[PDB]
Structure formats: structure tokens, C-alpha cells
Amino acid sequence: SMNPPPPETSNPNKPKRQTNQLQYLLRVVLKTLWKHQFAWPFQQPVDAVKLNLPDYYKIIKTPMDMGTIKKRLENNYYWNAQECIQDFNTMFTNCYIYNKPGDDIVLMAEALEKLFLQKINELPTEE
Ligand SMILES: CCc1c(C(=O)Nc2cccc(CCC(=O)NO)c2)[nH]c(C)c1C(C)=O
Numbered sequence: 492s493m494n495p496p497p498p499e500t501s502n503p504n505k506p507k508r509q510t511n512q513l514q515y516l517l518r519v520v521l522k523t524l525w526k527h528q529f530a531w532p533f534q535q536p537v538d539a540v541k542l543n544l545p546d547y548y549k550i551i552k553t554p555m556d557m558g559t560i561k562k563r564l565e566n567n568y569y570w571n572a573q574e575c576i577q578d579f580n581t582m583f584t585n586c587y588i589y590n591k592p593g594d595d596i597v598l599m600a601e602a603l604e605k606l607f608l609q610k611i612n613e614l615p616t617e618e
């Protein structure tokens with residue numbers, strides 16, 4: 492069994508930007524979620540080999556995780572905050588698609604997602 496290559500965190504053909512919203516997304520949103528009690532299963536790409544999940548990358552074709560998002564934010568990979576918010580939303584969506592309602596991993600995603608939504612409800616106005 493093989494894992495796909497991870498999502499890219501650098502691309503010299505992609506224009507980069509730093510905005511107050513993206514720095515809020517790193518300094519407040521990512522950092523808070525990273526330190527959460529249930530953040531461990533989301534801090535790196537799903538290793539479907541080691542977790543013996545051979546259908547995972549059969550079913551999930553846009554994988555995403557907070558390790559990738561952290562590296563994208565640290566590298567200023569994004570142009571705008573919506574790009575980064577979409578990556579979080581994809582991470583959560585994948586978990587809910589692949590797993591079953593009420594699974595442990597889904598209960599953990601639920602907690603992180605509730606905090607995520609509280610933080611982006613207060614996304615600062617673009618300056
Ligand atoms: C249930 C499987 C799953 C994990 C996980 O169980 N993740 C995990 C658990 C313990 C430790 C670590 C860090 C070391 C490592 O990466 N081992 O492979 C990750 N996460 C996600 C997003 C999923 C799925 C399919 O939605």
C-alpha cells in the first residue's frame with residue numbers, strides 16, 4: 492500500500508501574500524486548534540498505510556490536515572484568508588465523509604470544528 496504525496500506547501504509559481512486575516516489565521520486560529528486536546532489525529536496527513544485504511548485515498552481525493560495548513564501559513568503560501576479557511580473546511584469535510592457518524596474521530600473533529608467556527612466568526616476586517 493502507498494500514501495499519495497502530501498499536499499504541496501510551497502510553489503514558486505503561486506503568488507504569495509500576507510494579510511492581517513492570514514496572520515490571524517496562523518497566530519490565533521491554527522495555534523489554538525493545534526494545542527487543543529483532540530488535535531493529534533489532525534496534525535499530519537492521514538497515513539492510510541500505517542492506519543490500515545486502504546480505501547481512504549480511494550474515497551478522499553482532496554486530503555488536508557493541520558500540519559499542511561500550518562506549513563502553508565508559515566510559508567505565506569496563500570493569497571487570501573478564504574483559501575486557508577477552505578483548507579480547514581476540507582479537512583473537516585473529509586473526516587465526516589470517510590468516517591461514520593459518532594465515530595471517535597468524528598467526535599474529535601466536531602470539537603475542533605466548533606472552535607474553528609467560533610474563531611472565524613471573529614475574523615478581523617481586512618486592513
Ligand atoms: C481514524 C483514522 C484517522 C486519524 C488518526 O487516527 N490519526 C492519528 C492518531 C494517533 C496519532 C497520530 C499521529 C501519528 C500518526 O500519524 N500515525 O499514523 C495520528 N486521523 C484522521 C483524520 C483519521 C480519518 C480516517 O479521518
Ligand SMILES: CCc1c(C(=O)Nc2cccc(CCC(=O)NO)c2)[nH]c(C)c1C(C)=O
Nearest residue numbers: 580583584587588591592593597598601604
Ligand atoms: C458524520 C456526521 C457528522 C457531521 C457531518 O457530516 N458534517 C459535515 C459533512 C460535510 C461537510 C461539512 C461542512 C465542513 C465545514 O465546512 N466546516 O467548517 C460538515 N458533523 C458532525 C459533528 C457529525 C457527527 C457527530 O456525527
